[model samples]
Target: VSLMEKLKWKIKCIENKFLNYRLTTNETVVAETEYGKVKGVKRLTVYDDSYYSFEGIPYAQPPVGELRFKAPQRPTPWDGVRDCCNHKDKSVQVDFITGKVCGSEDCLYLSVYTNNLNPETKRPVLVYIHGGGFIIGENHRDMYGPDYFIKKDVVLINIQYRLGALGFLSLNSEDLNVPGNAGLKDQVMALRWIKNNCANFGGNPDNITVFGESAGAASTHYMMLTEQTRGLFHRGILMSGNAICPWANTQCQHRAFTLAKLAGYKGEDNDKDVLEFLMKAKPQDLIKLEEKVLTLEERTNKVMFPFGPTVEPYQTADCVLPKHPREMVKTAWGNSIPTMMGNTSYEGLFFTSILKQMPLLVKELETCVNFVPSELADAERTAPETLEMGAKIKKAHVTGETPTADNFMDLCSHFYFWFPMHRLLQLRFNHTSGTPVYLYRFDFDSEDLINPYRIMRSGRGVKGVSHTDELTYFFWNQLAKRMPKESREYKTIERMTGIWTQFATTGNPYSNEIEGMENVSWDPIEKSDEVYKCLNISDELKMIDVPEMGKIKQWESMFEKHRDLF
Candidate 1:
């Protein structure tokens, strides 16, 4: 018999035995790591492919009690086999989208899915970091399952870390006792663990790709900037998020002080004392404090992304973000690693209500446009200059028409999501020199007759792919499962999955046998290219030159003109 045939027969026999609950002693799925032995349960995907799932594997000691707001430490070794069949705890946070309060403080854990644990084939590993504005997210299997990726020769990992104030409340500089960025450090520790132990689960220690969406994508960008994470991962995929986004970072000292005051800390108004009081308070109290602050911000109609990465103080060690993010990108700090980043077509449409309570009047729209630069710059801008710039932007997008949902959202789409991503690519191409940066725009409009913005369509019409809509194409969903392979949605899914997996395996996404990629060459957004190119992913997949260069150029000029104020 052929080697491939023999292997298939052997696997079938093992599966039969497992399905019949007659597994022999040697058939148990157990992996050995540097720490100890872990026993995982064998699971079958919808495609009848068998894989082992190791869930809730602690990568670091729990950040509880004394470890609150401190950098994560290595996990303590344990005796006996660790049962990793069930998911571990998730970080404490109130879910903004679902309006659910879920997770725990003891939540620094990671889950792994692999079809091969023999360690003979060193498959590429894809480490996913969950995103919820660094406020609320989880690494649950149900949400981010490995059933899709494990079908190919890959090991998938999902990690969870602290969120909100527990993760990103900076009271002062690095020298202070309340040095922040605990959540980012947790991710760094998880990567370190993967580097050391992924090979045992048939993953290549040298070949790791860190990918994420939203805040997770922002985290991946932060990881690229950190010298501490140098050589930990070789590739990155950022979806709808980058370090340069206006909402990515915020000045949190004021918020931290507010939270402290809310917690009834009757101590001296010093950083050390404030931290002590916060740490001493119950986790529920902290969550309540955060909710109150958010309510206040929302009532004022102010856009606030308070809890996230910051330009940390100077520290020789344990500093995940030491310099400003713009400077890091300008200096090509992440030049060693190639990146794939893009966003959905209607990214800002998801924030329609968040930007304004109702359809903005022309005056309100003008006011918003005027404050765009200040919002983007994360600092106050000169009044006259901002007014002029805002007028120019309003004229370009709104065209002197009364502001409606479509026009206002389109303006925000460019202002908040697309333009920043464009500038980031420019900076990377200019500073990194040779690093091939692959850009894409998710323009897929699903044929499943399901409008993603149905809830937001109460008053004004909402069209185009909303933010994170591309995820349905890559991930396994109930709606996708019902579609046949010949359907356009399924084809899009197959094409996207192939492209992503091929990119993870090799540096390029289109070099291999990805479906629907025939006669198409996805050009990289390089410094040499006179114009940028993006893989416009839609029902009809094709490589196309990026549109709206004129608008982007206008915004660039505005940034240059207001360089001093911004």
Candidate 2:
């Protein structure tokens, strides 16, 4: 027999014998997932030490070659032992896209963790999606490790979906059989996989939290508006990202192909044609092509990214009554799910680190808000009333802080983080009486004082507790470690983990472990009053009224009145 055939036969035998269950060293019995059984590897963590893990499982078929731009297919079930011992094949990296390095397009996989893997123990599941602006980042990005959460006693699952063109492209029904939105479909499939099998991995299939940071957090909001994602999870975390995008739904088309043509792709229309043309090209060539395709006008005027999720009517039919996430949320789709969301202190510092080099004066901040692409501008502009109301709520956050360039930055925060989230919070609150919403402002600042890029970027300053800065304490990112520390990041980790896991287990984040933890009390806000908790990393905290430092509602109102023009 051929060597491949012989290997297959042996794999099948191992599957028949050991795929279902395994007896650990202590004779404690454990079960393997269908993915584990097929891959012929045991997914385990130290149960006695309060952690367990299952790595390198495929959530969808590899989106390589012809599969590119197509909705993800269900991962094929294995007939015999499959080896999932290592990370699945990574899709192309982002170096090529931004003219950096070569990247592949075969990246669709997930990793999972839980305190208990027993089928009946039933624990809440928290699934994390990584961030890279829907273009780059991997599930194995070291900082987002599940080690801490397992210790805190909740199941954690991390997934990687397609990025950039391969993941977000959507072709209309007239163009081809497979439409756009493969990336989102992959996420939905991952949810389905979790719902079907999470319990087998010791997770409560009902209590799932889908959360992300940066672009991943953006995706979290997008999923919230999506009908397809309605029953997928019961809660969400939108960390340092809000419902904002560079382009509108009406504009997602051929932009990537235009770049591809510049990159030297000679293909005609259709997914298969494009894949064939680009696969043979060098990664550097692809990058160059992507860069070349940008006409100054397209770059400066229209969004340059080729793909984004569509507001299709049929895709979300199963889970949402409305066709799109925004529509569902507008009409009260899955607003019943409890949500906890926030932006880091000086969150603008993360995105503005590079822009600060270009001379972003307070005047420039308003102009820059104007420069924001139409989709975001429209969302911001159209929601003015909500912004007006929310601003009335956030007056203190702005006025209390001195009006400096820092004030300008905080104003940008209102435009981006505070307003968008408040709009979402209002919709969630208005949608249902039972679902509770918790909003927080991370007032803690990291001590990472040195700004290495200061000299290069002309003293743009450190990112402070910007963007994903808080992620380091929750997950384990080295990028966060470089920040100057005023206190123990890990203690904050414990507190944060307690809130997250407690909420995952039940709808509330305040409970047993946090009841007497010093003076920190995370009071849930009621519609009758506007009081909110000021979450500080230091032992001391401030319980203040709604909005952190400014009138969040006013900034949103301006955007509302001028969103289209802005």
Candidate 3:
């Protein structure tokens, strides 16, 4: 707000606008980056508001061929002004709708969006990592439009890292040099790039906030645990996912070999042989192998994703995630960093939809006895022991006679997303990070606008809000139907973006009063042992205690007891 900063901003504003003034005009704005000068375009949103967008800028070298499973390397600097007007291809993964392979291997890109072109403004930065179970996701404008964020004086960034095997499949051998968590490493590299160059985009390099939904949320929490991402980000906002989830960080060494077999390995039966075959395998051939390599348990019993973040086997120089998330979180280095974490009211409701897709879910949970997290039913334990664990879960969670999606929804949501957030809260609370940890639960369920689970199922799953339901409120998703400007959904969008940008701008989310969200006093979780005050994001924004702690503790004891199972 200083005179010189304001003057520089105004000068850049006219420069971007003057092109629209003449007949021989173009909508172009250029910024000097460390790699080179990137030429972006000035565009307007659906609401007729203007913002400058820089798309598909590489943050790291492409992880193809020999660098497939290796750690990310810094991008090579470009020579001249590079065109960044369009989005780049996403990482190789199964297409969400098509079910066939899509995207490319050379996909380590980030997009920048802001109204101010002057670097001196030093606006707060909000870098987003999209979520699709870490298997499939993209930072495309079609899904993640920054229209709401651009309305505020902040820089909004959408980023893409390697997905599925291309990102997380590691051999875990020192000789092979394929330590897992390359996806997380890709994020670390992107954060470093933003830390170094955000000032060029009118953002404060020192005031960066990293946030995301689902797998991206888990990725953010994992990033906070490791030393590799110590100073890369200042604040983190995780929505509906965290590392405490059983599915977040699991054993992937077996999955790597399973993938090699699926890719038709013909070499000798060693780690090097398997890796060599994988190195030579086609990207598309390796893309959907998670479907082929999944066990019945991972497919049906609410296990972890096939190819995601994992603990590195070696203590090598580039080792990220050396320990399990729970252990790492106990001694998490960024405890002092401010954080915001919460989920939807019906987080597990989406699991019911997934359950509906299965052939005989009722028979499996009731009679088959193979329907619980893999961590409890690990290979070391006996089938009978796992069956006992399954019986305990079924008797406790599923009160209905038939274990349908509605009946089994609690078991799915509890183990998958809910209790994981609860356990993570306990870890963060115990760390005494000395900073506030704000929590919120999105309970607004709109038939017309907000529910993203509808994308998964045509019919309904459950009554409450499901996973990824809160995201539509933040971004203008072109894939889903748009809501009217006068609707309550639009007002909710204002409140979500207000709290988000406010947190990014200042260290606190409730420091200044939100425009439409007045009298809404936001507080942090002072205690983690019991139900604490969490903001319920519904028709009315108010502070409410997080429900379902008693049920969540049942899951906590389930994990603890099964760990001792012999």
TM-score of each candidate structure, all chains considered together? 0.88, 0.76, 0.89
- Model 1, span 1-566: residue lDDT tens: 23553454456445544542431123356788788889888776555567788888999988899888888999998788998877887788874433446678899999988878875669989999877788877876545656667767888899998998989888774456555688999999999999999988999988899999888898898888878888898899999888777777765665776788888877667777787788888886787578665544332334456667877655636877767677787664566577898888777667655545544433456545433654443334336656667666766577554666666767767776777777787677656748688988889876363322223322134556777667666654322344665888767767777777788888787854766667678877767676778888886667887775666666766676556422
| lDDT for each candidate structure | 0.73, 0.57, 0.77
The better-scoring model by lDDT among 2 and 3 is 3
Over the stretch 1-566, how does candidate 3's per-residue lDDT look in tens digits? Answer: 23553454456445533533421216887899999999998877656677888998999988888898889999899888899987899889986544678899989999999977874567999999988889988987656878778988999999998888889887756888888888889998998899989888988888999998988998888778888878888999988888877778778787777888877876565788788888889899998777777786566555557888888888767677888877888788767799998888877677654555665665665743454556567463357767676666677677677766565666666767777777677766777647888988888887666433355543243467778778878886543444577788887888889889888877788733555457677778776336667888888887877776667766566566644421
- TM-score, predicted candidate 1 vs. hidden true structure: 0.88
> Among these predicted structures, which one has the highest lDDT?
3
Alpha-carbon lDDT of model 1: 0.73
Q: After superposing candidate 1, which stretches have Cα over 4 Å from the reference?
A: 1-28, 173-176, 294-303, 314-316, 353-363, 367-371, 375-382, 447-462, 477-482, 562-566
Looking at model 3, residue 70 earns an lDDT score of: 86
* Best model per TM-score: 3
Worst 10 residues of 1 by lDDT: 451-460
- Lowest summed lDDT over 10 consecutive residues: which window, candidate 2? 449-458
Residue-pair clashes per candidate: 0, 37, 0
Query: Model 1 clash tally?
Result: 0
lDDT of 2 at 112: 74
Model 3 spans with C-alpha error above 4 angstroms:
1-25, 297-301, 363-396, 400-404, 450-453, 459-463, 480-482, 559-566
